[PDB]
Design an enzyme around this catalytic site. Structure first.
Site, PDB file in Angstrom:
ATOM      1  N   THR A   1     -22.408 -21.424   0.897  1.00  0.00           N
ATOM      2  CA  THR A   1     -23.778 -20.834   0.828  1.00  0.00           C
ATOM      3  C   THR A   1     -24.709 -21.809   0.106  1.00  0.00           C
ATOM      4  OG1 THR A   1     -23.380 -19.561  -1.188  1.00  0.00           O
ATOM      5  CG2 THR A   1     -22.853 -18.488   0.882  1.00  0.00           C
ATOM      6  N   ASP A   2     -24.284 -22.326  -1.043  1.00  0.00           N
ATOM      7  CA  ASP A   2     -25.047 -23.361  -1.781  1.00  0.00           C
ATOM      8  C   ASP A   2     -25.107 -24.645  -0.950  1.00  0.00           C
ATOM      9  OD1 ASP A   2     -26.260 -22.553  -4.290  1.00  0.00           O
ATOM     10  OD2 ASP A   2     -24.199 -22.257  -5.104  1.00  0.00           O
TER      11      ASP A   2
ATOM     12  N   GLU B   1     -20.732 -28.351  -3.278  1.00  0.00           N
ATOM     13  CA  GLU B   1     -21.828 -27.413  -2.920  1.00  0.00           C
ATOM     14  C   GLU B   1     -23.193 -28.107  -2.893  1.00  0.00           C
ATOM     15  OE1 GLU B   1     -22.403 -24.447  -5.946  1.00  0.00           O
ATOM     16  OE2 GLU B   1     -21.469 -25.589  -7.512  1.00  0.00           O
TER      17      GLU B   1
ATOM     18  N   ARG C   1     -13.639 -18.998 -11.561  1.00  0.00           N
ATOM     19  CA  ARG C   1     -14.753 -19.873 -11.179  1.00  0.00           C
ATOM     20  C   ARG C   1     -15.703 -19.879 -12.379  1.00  0.00           C
ATOM     21  NH1 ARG C   1     -18.902 -20.333  -7.032  1.00  0.00           N
ATOM     22  NH2 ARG C   1     -19.505 -18.138  -7.280  1.00  0.00           N
TER      23      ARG C   1
ATOM     24  N   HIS D   1     -21.806 -16.205 -10.862  1.00  0.00           N
ATOM     25  CA  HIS D   1     -22.699 -15.274 -10.111  1.00  0.00           C
ATOM     26  C   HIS D   1     -22.204 -13.841 -10.305  1.00  0.00           C
ATOM     27  CE1 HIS D   1     -25.262 -18.427  -8.896  1.00  0.00           C
ATOM     28  NE2 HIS D   1     -24.253 -19.113  -8.338  1.00  0.00           N
TER      29      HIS D   1
HETATM   30 MG    MG Z   1     -23.577 -23.042  -6.919  1.00  0.00          MG
END
Ligand code: MG
Ligand code: MG
Ligand code: MG
Ligand code: MG
Ligand code: MG
Ligand code: MG
Lengths: 252, 250, 252, 250, 250, 252
Positions: D170-171, D145, D69, D44
């Site tokens: 969040t996911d 997630e 990540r 992200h």
């Molecule tokens: Mg994700």
């Protein structure tokens, strides 16, 4: 929290430095981890621009060697931007006069000793809160001597307080004196010129460095009492090594 | 012409360089030495696509055939390198016939494979008649670097659309339970390496090998290896720098 | 089809600007979308080279803020290349004399008003066919005042028609006057010097800008009538924010 | 030594930074603060391989353990990051035991996994004895997630070659049908997060979590999380800039 | 708003540019012409992620919708481009319903797909209400460039989470056993192209096509194609340079 | 082992050159493979920095055309670094005086003929062991004439032995004379000025080049006896081509 070249000098020992014309961080770190006190990144006779030098300075520092730059030109704003990116040694080409040596000195030192602009992004991270107090000592400045004019003006160049001393380019000095630009030139007039500069640097209580194209030439220069000896360019060492590997692979 | 394929067609092996350092200057300089090809390593290096692209140009200008050892046997990655002027592919971890077929699929346009058509750099080198000769412009070698690949060597070699195999002897040494030393004397690794070479030549296929030294490369050439790499730019440069420092410091 | 800083000035309002020492487009766009009139990319006290500044100017413009550059040096050819890449404000360091202020002015304006070379790659895309008619108004030029000499020459610097005015670097001015290079320095002699420059700029009908290291210092400078206020460097704001997050995470 | 592993061996959790902005200067500066590790986000963010490589160097010089990540749980991508001096891996979308085994396969040389041998940067840090200690130099965390990962938590935690799991809350909130808010108070998300932590510690494994604030990071540390990230460089910088502008404009 | 989706909602097709040359300057200049969208080709070009990222910014500033033709139908690659401000995706080699479902999975957050949440650039364009409208901000087209895709067209078009299909007519020509000529008159290729268009519109889906010329683009628009690309920057620049040299040399 | 522009000149023929403002290697190679003798990379009116020019010089050479650079500025150290990266032609902007023409000449030639620093990384690879013997002939140097001052000083500029001649920028010459900066300007005073420079260059036994925005203008300049004609910028040719494709796609 010390310049590794300056530590050598404070112990009355010379520094041995690498010399990089190839951009990138991996060989920079690997060579920095060998028994080099410093690694000079050449930004003159290479395709290394500012974008490529920046991460190389980081790689050399991680390796444990003092990151040096040989600049394209004795330009104060170029030199200041390299100091703030963690270049802790400067070799400036074509210093032919006292005024040009004063231009180099002006870039290496904060006011009152020079006019270095304040924004030390990477030196403040390395040295912490006690950086400004010792900023001048964290940096080594050498004026290049590579012309007839610089040879004639050597005592006036060495009279400049704010430079540690001079750095001999023997191939350009050979070329400017009307001789072949040979690697590790032993042309008699060039050898005399080089010995003269070394004698005048040490008479003035200043340091003298020299570019070498081989370990053998570097050994002699160290034996002659040079304070800062570079050997040898990554590109030249890699091409020589590759030629030899090919010759051994192809042999009867 | 593909300079490696010209060697092979004239009954000679190819000697290749091996680059783990990104940049064009050493790539061109080594390409101009007596190397037939120069392999850019995109696996055991920090060379990404952005950095490989101008290196392929630099090797071609030098007069050597630009090769890439890819990160992975991925058809879409291989196709993007072919269209950027990679004229040789060494794909890691080809352990089965199906994986060898995946490599072949990327090297050939339909009907022989599924290579996507948009040959940006090969169309500049070869001109409008590139499609007719595209397969011959490219050399494809499947890596043999596991016990599984060793066990499946005959099935890997049965795939018509690969030129043959490339031995990764350090990984092969490690997967056989031995020290991952380059140019190893370990009896079982030497036997396995000779076995792969014998099976490749029995199947009418080419065999290559990664070497750490000129002396080991000489022996591999004398043993009949078609494609011999010696030695990585980083390993040669580090050895040369150590020696220069030893000579300087007496 | 207007310089957003110039629109502020035409309404008799000051402009508030961001200040980037970190290369990249993502933070540049995000900060440009906040309530900044402009975002200054620092090419002096940062590792941002031309290659990295070019896409950042695009990102700031998309965000809705006026892209500015603080250059490494008052060099006309450097400044012209940034204008043609869509830098619409220039802050030039070390303008110490009228002649140096004339050198800055020379780069910002086409003939007859200066000697700017014609090839406006990005301004022609932003402004279209009516660019040349309004080219001088699309660009803001500020001469940096950061030395004793610049302080002494302030009225001669401000007499140059082709600059909008001056930009105070208070930390370098502190250092050049023999004081600590403190962020938002309130050293009495430096505060007097800064007030003097502001008074002389406004007496000459010229603009005065100032670098701030905090929102609190920026509020006071806006209240004092400064036309162009920067606050605060992305690196300093990010490091302060990270320290505070760590302190809150580690607290009893 | 791996500084996160040193924390764990001394019975302490690790606090980590989180970078979505490419570049070395903020990476070194944040590494020099009281962070044990700094995670570079390659999912992200616009950080590609070209940009991650010098950032790993900058974090290491700063004194923090460089983590990545990744975009995807891909063995060849993970191996290239390990050889560039990534000493921690957080792999997204580990939803099954088989996917956890794919992550473990990339972190360990044969016989324990299938990591390819060519450790460019780890061999410079650790020297010639790197192979013997390679597995311990690297921290591997599987992301949890999804509802699927939550359902398969025990089977994911049974894989010996991962240190444990990293919660992407969040996911996880989004996949449970809730607002993807960081540091959520949503009862079901808080229950699921506590459940994953309890199961990880029951299996003798480590548990990490992504946090948006120092205050939330404090609570997660007090709850016994082994690896706590706070907070993304972009989110911290934007909040700081908003506040500076509010103070400037009164 | 997505400018292609606005065209479609107002009962108009979109005309798009096509970039194989990396860099922001031509990208912005072409975006400012009468193009609704500009496709960056990441397959048949040397454009890597590092180079695409600022190009998406440049196209958006120009006023055109930034699109990417990806190297591969890979969900994690597509998600990273969406979070960098790619607002259209053309995925190659969609040959089956399952492959079309893989494309759809990457374009939509849970519950409709498995898109990972961290929308760096879309959250800056669209603000805090992005999640509610995220699916409509993005246009997804599956490439039809094989006999297999042609055979499976109805099953590909049955996938609700793609806007429709994008014909790659040079690859389709090659896979049908014909010359890979752009803008082909080859009877069977023209029939196959018309067939795909008819089936897309019968299923209430959009159809696009790659064109090599303005004259061919005019006919495709007149035939009812929803999304027409003309023509690649490299092909247009080379043709223009040849003509300038012919005019100069008389 | 020859400069392709110099081969044209030795056969008494002009050279036709491309002109690149877009960074990257793919269009550089493609245009180099067309019937261009040289391809000029513009580092002034473009976003092309040193990092981006370096691989473009390689791409042009592979294509079979002579790689040229139009520099940002007549700076000797910038020009030397491009020569060592395989730039075999230099067009230096704003040469307005003999002394500025001597500054350009100084960078193109090793001692004794100039002061070019020795480290020819890429020329040594192209030319091999016989490079130094023929180094001056491998490089073409043109001084830009784009001001009133340069026009007035044309005979003094042309008296400098170490430059091949001059390169006319007609749009900047139009702008500096107080006219519209039109592409392929035929403003009567500018046409007279351009003919005067061409006449004086050929009277001095020197070469004259000119920038063209079209094939049609380039044909006339070749017919007028210009030695070096550029046509046309990649960006302008691509934008014109794209406009036409869109107009044909959208037509009734
Ligand atoms: Mg994700
Ligand atoms: Mg300053
Ligand atoms: Mg295709
Ligand atoms: Mg000009
Ligand atoms: Mg391997
Ligand atoms: Mg020199």
């Amino acid at each position: 929290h010390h310049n590794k070249v300056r530590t050598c000098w404070n112990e009355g020992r010379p520094a041995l430095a690498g010399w990089l014309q190839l951009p990138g961080t991996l060989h920079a770190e690997a060579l920095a981890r060998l028994d080099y006190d410093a690694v000079v990144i050449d930004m003159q006779h290479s395709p290394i621009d500012f974008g490529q030098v920046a991460p190389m300075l980081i790689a050399i520092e991680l390796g444990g060697a003092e990151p040096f730059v040989r600049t394209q030109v004795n330009d104060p704003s170029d030199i200041m931007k390299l100091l703030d990116a963690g270049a802790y040694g400067i070799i400036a080409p074509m210093v032919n006069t006292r005024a040009e040596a004063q231009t180099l000195a002006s870039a290496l030192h904060y006011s009152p000793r020079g006019l270095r602009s304040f924004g030390p992004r990477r030196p403040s991270l390395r040295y912490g809160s006690g950086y400004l107090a010792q900023a001048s000592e964290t940096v080594v400045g050498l004026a290049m001597i590579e012309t007839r004019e610089a040879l004639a003006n050597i005592d006036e160049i060495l009279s400049v307080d704010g430079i540690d001393g001079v750095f001999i380019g023997p191939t350009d000095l050979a070329l400017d004196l009307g001789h072949a630009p040979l690697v590790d030139t032993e042309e008699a007039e060039v050898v005399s010129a080089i010995a003269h500069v070394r004698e005048r640097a040490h008479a003035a209580g200043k340091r003298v460095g020299i570019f070498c194209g081989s370990g053998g030439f570097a050994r002699v220069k160290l034996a002659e009492g040079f304070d800062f000896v570079t050997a040898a360019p990554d590109l030249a060492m890699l091409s020589a090594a590759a030629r030899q590997v090919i010759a051994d692979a192809r042999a009867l």
